[PDB]
Every structure is written in structure tokens, then in C-alpha cells.
Design a protein around this ligand. Structure first.
Ligand SMILES: [Sb+3]
Ligand SMILES: [Zn+2]
Length: 194
């Protein structure tokens, strides 16, 4: 079956925030509120902000999972193309088939679900650093949207679930993802069709 993508703020008032980076040619990662769509270059830092009304307990965990947006493709597992799967860009932690990685977190953990075969990456929730109102996770996407043998120009969603130490759903949110060479231009072009 297909993982739930239904928004759920839950007890702790869980929602996602994004940097306001604009669409200049030099930008590596930019978000479109209009499309609720993130545009990142291959393997480059993709900051996602966790916002809460109340601090969840210690041992709370944040999980990222990719699915295909279109109904006909939803049952197919999102994974890296054979080319990117084979290439030597391994960090020693991430499985080579996994699209979504986390950088600068040695407590990162990766799951091949034994039932659904779905890929996900999970880190411990940490409260905001002193002088901050949200928690930032740096994701890396390791395959282009245009990759034949992979996503093959098919739109994907990233599902961020907040869960406790025992794996109970606390909150869920989602955003569309495109991995492309010129994020600035592509966002500006996709917003032009409004
Ligand atoms: Sb990005
Ligand atoms: Zn690829």
C-alpha cells in the first residue's frame, strides 16, 4: 500500500519552515510557497526547518521518505538510478540506493522497510540552538529528477514525520521536490505558469 501524506500538526504543533533564498542563478537550494515545492542541485545542502509550539520529549525522531506524486506511480518505491547507485560518492553511512541522505549528523540512521521496501532516513530531534526558533536538518538528494532508470522526470514528494522513541506518529508534513541543475530558473519558470 501507499504511505499517508496527510498534514498533521499534532500535540506539539509540528510544521515545516524554509529559508527565503530567492531565484538568483547562484542559489543552490530554493523553496516555492506557491507550489509548496523545493528546488535543489544534486547532493547539495537542502535545509528543512522543524517548527513546534511545544518541545517534544528527548529521544523524539524526525524521518524523511520520498514517494511519487502521481496516483499511477505511488506504489513504486522511489530509489536512485543504477548509475548514481554505482557511483563512488558513499559517505560510509547511507545505503547506495537511497535518494535522501542527511549531512553533518553522525547519529543518522537509514531504513529499508522489510514489508513495504520503502527507503527512509531518521535523525534524533534536537531543540532549536540558542538564538533560534526552529531546528534545521541538512538533507542531500543524490539523484536528478531527469535521471532515466530513476525518477525519469516524475514529480516526487518528501514526507517528514515526527515520531517518539517508540515510533508513534506525533506529526506529519510534506513538500514536492525537484533535483535540477538551475533551481533558481526552474522555480521562476514553474511560478510563471500562474
Ligand atoms: Sb533544496
Ligand atoms: Zn540518478
Amino acid at each position: 500500500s501507499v504511505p499517508s501524506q496527510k498534514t498533521y500538526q499534532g500535540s506539539y504543533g509540528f510544521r515545516l519552515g524554509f529559508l527565503h533564498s530567492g531565484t538568483a542563478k547562484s542559489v543552490t537550494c530554493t523553496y516555492s510557497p506557491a507550489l509548496n515545492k523545493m528546488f535543489c542541485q544534486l547532493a547539495k545542502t537542502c535545509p528543512v526547518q522543524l517548527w513546534v509550539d511545544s518541545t517534544p520529549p528527548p529521544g523524539t525522531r524526525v524521518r524523511a521518505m520520498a514517494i511519487y506524486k502521481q496516483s499511477q506511480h505511488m506504489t513504486e518505491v522511489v530509489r536512485r538510478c543504477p548509475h548514481h547507485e554505482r557511483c563512488s560518492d558513499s559517505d560510509g553511512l547511507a545505503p547506495p540506493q537511497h535518494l535522501i541522505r542527511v549531512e553533518g549528523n553522525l547519529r543518522v540512521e537509514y531504513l529499508d522497510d522489510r514489508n513495504t521496501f520503502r527507503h527512509s532516513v531518521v535523525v534524533p530531534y534536537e531543540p532549536p540552538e540558542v538564538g533560534s526558533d526552529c531546528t534545521t536538518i541538512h538533507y542531500n538528494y543524490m539523484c536528478n529528477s531527469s535521471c532515466m532508470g530513476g525518477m525519469n522526470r516524475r514529480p516526487i514528494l518528501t514526507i517528514i514525520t515526527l515520531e517518539d522513541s517508540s515510533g508513534n506518529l506525533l506529526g506529519r508534513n510534506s513538500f514536492e521536490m525537484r533535483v535540477c541543475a538551475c533551481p533558481g530558473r526552474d522555480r521562476r519558470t514553474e511560478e510563471e505558469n500562474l
